[PDB]
Amino acid sequence: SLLSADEKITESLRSTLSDVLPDQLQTYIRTVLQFSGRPEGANLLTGPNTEIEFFSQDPNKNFPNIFAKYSNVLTVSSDPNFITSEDEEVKIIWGRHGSDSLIGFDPGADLVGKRRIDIFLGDFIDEQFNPIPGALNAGKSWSDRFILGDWQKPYYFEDDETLGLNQSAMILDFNPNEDVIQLHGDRQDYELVNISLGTAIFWREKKGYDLIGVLGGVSDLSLKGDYFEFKGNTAPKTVLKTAEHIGTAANDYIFSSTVDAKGNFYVGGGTGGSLGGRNIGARDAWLAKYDSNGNQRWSRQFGSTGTESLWGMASDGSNIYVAGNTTGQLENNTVKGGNDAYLAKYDSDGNQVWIKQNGTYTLEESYKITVDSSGNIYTAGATFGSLGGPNQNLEQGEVFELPSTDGYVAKFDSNGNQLWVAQFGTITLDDNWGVAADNNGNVFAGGNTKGSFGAKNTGTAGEYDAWLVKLNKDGQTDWVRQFGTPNYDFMWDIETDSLGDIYATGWTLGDLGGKNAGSYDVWLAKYNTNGNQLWIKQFGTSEDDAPFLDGIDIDANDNIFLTGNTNGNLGGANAGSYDAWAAKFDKDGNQLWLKQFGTPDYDTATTVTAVNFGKLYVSGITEGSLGTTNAGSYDSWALKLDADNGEIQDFNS
Numbered sequence: 015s016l017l018s019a020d021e022k023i024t025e026s027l028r029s030t031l032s033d034v035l036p037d038q039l040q041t042y043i044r045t046v047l048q049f050s051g052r053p054e055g056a057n058l059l060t061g062p063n064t065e066i067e068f069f070s071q072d073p074n075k076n077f078p079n080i081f082a083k084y085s086n087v088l089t090v091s092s093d094p095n096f097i098t099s100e101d102e103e104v105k106i107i108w109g110r111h112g113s114d115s116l117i118g119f120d121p122g123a124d125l126v127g128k129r130r131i132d133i134f135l136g137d138f139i140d141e142q143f144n145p146i147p148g149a150l151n152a153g154k155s156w157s158d159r160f161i162l163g164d165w166q167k168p169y170y171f172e173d174d175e176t177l178g179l180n181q182s183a184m185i186l187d188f189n190p191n192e193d194v195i196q197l198h199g200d201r202q203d204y205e206l207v208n209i210s211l212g213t214a215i216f217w218r219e220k221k222g223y224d225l226i227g228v229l230g231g232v233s234d235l236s237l238k239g240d241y242f243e244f245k246g247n248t249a250p251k252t253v254l255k256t257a258e259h260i261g262t263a264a265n266d267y268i269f270s271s272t273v274d275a276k277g278n279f280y281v282g283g284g285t286g287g288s289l290g291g292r293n294i295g296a297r298d299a300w301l302a303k304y305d306s307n308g309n310q311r312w313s314r315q316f317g318s319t320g321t322e323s324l325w326g327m328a329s330d331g332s333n334i335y336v337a338g339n340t341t342g343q344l345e346n347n348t349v350k351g352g353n354d355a356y357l358a359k360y361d362s363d364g365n366q367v368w369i370k371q372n373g374t375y376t377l378e379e380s381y382k383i384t385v386d387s388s389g390n391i392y393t394a395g396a397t398f399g400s401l402g403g404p405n406q407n408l409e410q411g412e413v414f415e416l417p418s419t420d421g422y423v424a425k426f427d428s429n430g431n432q433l434w435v436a437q438f439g440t441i442t443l444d445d446n447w448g449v450a451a452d453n454n455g456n457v458f459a460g461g462n463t464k465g466s467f468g469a470k471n472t473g474t475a476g477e478y479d480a481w482l483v484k485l486n487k488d489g490q491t492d493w494v495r496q497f498g499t500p501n502y503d504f505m506w507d508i509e510t511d512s513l514g515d516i517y518a519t520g521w522t523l524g525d526l527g528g529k530n531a532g533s534y535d536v537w538l539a540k541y542n543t544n545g546n547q548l549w550i551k552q553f554g555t556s557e558d559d560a561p562f563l564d565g566i567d568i569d570a571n572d573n574i575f576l577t578g579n580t581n582g583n584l585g586g587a588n589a590g591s592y593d594a595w596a597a598k599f600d601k602d603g604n605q606l607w608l609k610q611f612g613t614p615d616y617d618t619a620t621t622v623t624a625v626n627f628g629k630l631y632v633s634g635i636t637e638g639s640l641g642t643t644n645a646g647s648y649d650s651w652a653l654k655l656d657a658d659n660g661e662i663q664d665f666n667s
């Protein structure tokens with residue numbers, strides 16, 4: 015019976031949210047939701063007002079740590095939730111700009127009996143907090159997809175004698191004119207109830223009801239509305255049986271790839287399941303080796319009871335170096351506080367040689383790694399602390415400036431000894447999305463900034479620009495460059511060619527290398543070793559086109575390969591939702607080919623690696639059945655392409 019559902023839902027959500035979320039975070043959230051005009055969730059947080067310790071050096075009190083522990087803050091891009099992990103009872107999942115595919119509940123995780131509330135914000139963009147109107151994106155919003163179930167099962171589903179209040183989504187900014195709520199089954203499986211908070215979505219069967227989600231501030235919806243997408247009960251039909259399929263019942267992601275000197279191909283990423291080994295807890299890091307004929311030689315899985323991923327990998331020709339972040343304590347290491355970065359070394363036989371966990375009392379992230387021809391290793395990332403030197407935003411002064419990251423680069427020898435760490439940026443946000451060594455002892459880094467790092471930012475409201483830094487063999491800066499439009503421009507990855515010139519790829523909402531075709535467009539920029547911008551190419555469709563994650567590689571012939579996602583007809587007719595794409599360019603930016611592939615469901619490439627004089631590998635993630643039947647939520651895939659024309663080959667030969 016749905017009698018008194020309103021009262022029961024409010025008391026359940028209030029009790030769980032107020033029991034789980036720290037008082038500092040409750041105080042912060044209450045302030046934000048009231049200021050923003052999304053106040054429905056506020057009365058659910060009843061902890062006392064508490065001083066927010068934005069700059070505490072105690073890892074347990076440091077507010078960036080607290081906020082990060084209970085949130086997935088996504089990017090200005092159209093994001094899948096690439097950071098989701100079953101490590102907390104309550105999570106705030108914040109899509110920000112772009113058309114986000116928002117998930118927080120892993121249907122393959124053992125969550126029986128666990129309290130689970132995912133609080134979703136599809137947009138709630140940064141511009142809402144602008145004291146001054148007129149910013150280019152003020153008042154803009156995007157179609158976000160809130161994933162509350164799929165072909166396999168409803169999410170947040172306890173399937174018991176209660177109303178199923180212990181697990182539920184709470185979507186705070188659902189706009190039925192733009193957004194979509196994705197549900198398992200069909201409309202006859204649900205009942206909507208108007209409640210004080212908005213709308214309750216109940217799964218309904220003969221034996222009773224189970225609360226799947228609450229939509230704050232919206233009432234009088236219809237399950238016949240096109241803003242509900244029902245997924246039935248049957249896994250998607252398989253396409254691209256030529257691909258290598260990697261998947262478990264849980265969320266599985268390839269985030270990076272590399273090749274060794276013998277042509278063996280490696281992939282890796284994160285998994286909520288038991289992919290390379292038995293799951294240790296929440297998301298673990300994993301990697302796998304394939305021979306050049308496509309046979310898997312081994313898979314390995316590592317981490318902690320907390321959350322970690324492999325975000326980058328590279329080879330010295332034999333060994334495989336891997337980099338990412340962790341929320342826990344890795345083997346043979348000590349935590350530095352909050353989230354930390356790590357570098358690890360695997361030999362060609364899959365033996366873990368060592369792991370080095372590094373960081374400060376506050377949050378580090380690290381998505382990038384490169385290995386030079388001498389065998390030294392560079393990682394890069396961002397830090398809220400003072401890792402390579404004092405953070406540009408050290409403490410709170412008379413003018414408050416929100417705690418913010420600087421970029422860093424760290425150099426290591428083959429035994430994992432740290433040779434130096436460099437840190438740089440502005441008082442505001444500076445993130446890292448690239449690292450690449452040249453042949454002459456230098457290393458480049460790149461990323462995004464809200465500030466004026468290498469040049470005056472032409473945005474009027476702190477919109478992102480791209481930046482590049484050249485460091486010498488000792489970690490000293492030789493130059494800093496910055497480029498962009500007045501709108502958001504976002505870098506994903508960088509790489510050098512055989513001459514030592516530096517290339518970067520990303521997306522733009524403006525006219526960076528030419529007239530924007532619509533929405534997000536792709537760019538490729540080239541700088542010489544002396545910091546001169548040589549050219550920027552921009553291309554796309556009228557729809558949303560972007561590289562993603564490990565989006566560039568350069569082969570021994572100085573051909574450039576890019577990869578990412580598009581919801582347009584970029585390389586061909588779109589199969590449905592976002593598809594993957596890849597492209598090849600020469601060193602002067604002439605585009606040699608452009609291909610698109612995927613399933614009728616959401617796909618994105620995440621990594622591209624070219625074998626010198628061999629095959630091209632494009633790998634990524636999907637909600638569809640790519641290679642074989644989807645085993646649960648996100649699965650991953652690798653495609654072997656002919657590098658001359660982008661045509662897909664059978665993975666196994």
Ligand SMILES: CCCC[C@@H](F)CCCC[C@H](C)Cc1cc(O)c([C@@H](CCCC)CCCC[C@H](C)Cc2cc(O)cc(O)c2)c(O)c1
Nearest residue numbers: 043046077078081087140379396416417418419442443445
């Ligand atoms: C209920 C909804 C809450 C929504 C909102 F309340 C959350 C504020 C959390 C703030 C937290 C204490 C710390 C933090 C800061 C940070 O920058 C980032 C970056 C990631 C870059 C570093 C890896 C992405 C998110 C930027 C969003 C800014 C609003 C943009 C900004 C930055 C800035 O430096 C100055 C500004 O004025 C505005 C975090 O992920 C977490």
Ligand SMILES: [Ca+2]
Nearest residue numbers: 089091109111
């Ligand atoms: Ca986004």
Ligand SMILES: [Ca+2]
Nearest residue numbers: 109110112136
């Ligand atoms: Ca969004």
Ligand SMILES: [Ca+2]
Nearest residue numbers: 136137156158
């Ligand atoms: Ca939206």
Ligand SMILES: [Ca+2]
Nearest residue numbers: 170178181225
């Ligand atoms: Ca439920």
Ligand SMILES: [Ca+2]
Nearest residue numbers: 295297318320
């Ligand atoms: Ca783990």
Ligand SMILES: [Ca+2]
Nearest residue numbers: 351353373374
């Ligand atoms: Ca840390």
Ligand SMILES: [Ca+2]
Nearest residue numbers: 419439440442
């Ligand atoms: Ca900074």
Ligand SMILES: [Ca+2]
Nearest residue numbers: 478498499501
């Ligand atoms: Ca810009």
Ligand SMILES: [Ca+2]
Nearest residue numbers: 534554555557
């Ligand atoms: Ca476009």
Ligand SMILES: [Ca+2]
Nearest residue numbers: 507564566567
């Ligand atoms: Ca790369």
Ligand SMILES: [Ca+2]
Nearest residue numbers: 590592613615
């Ligand atoms: Ca697709």
Ligand SMILES: [Ca+2]
Nearest residue numbers: 262264646648
């Ligand atoms: Ca899966």
Ligand SMILES: [Cl-]
Nearest residue numbers: 088089090091
């Ligand atoms: Cl971002």
Ligand SMILES: [Cl-]
Nearest residue numbers: 141142152153
């Ligand atoms: Cl706004």
Ligand SMILES: [Cl-]
Nearest residue numbers: 176177178179
């Ligand atoms: Cl109940």
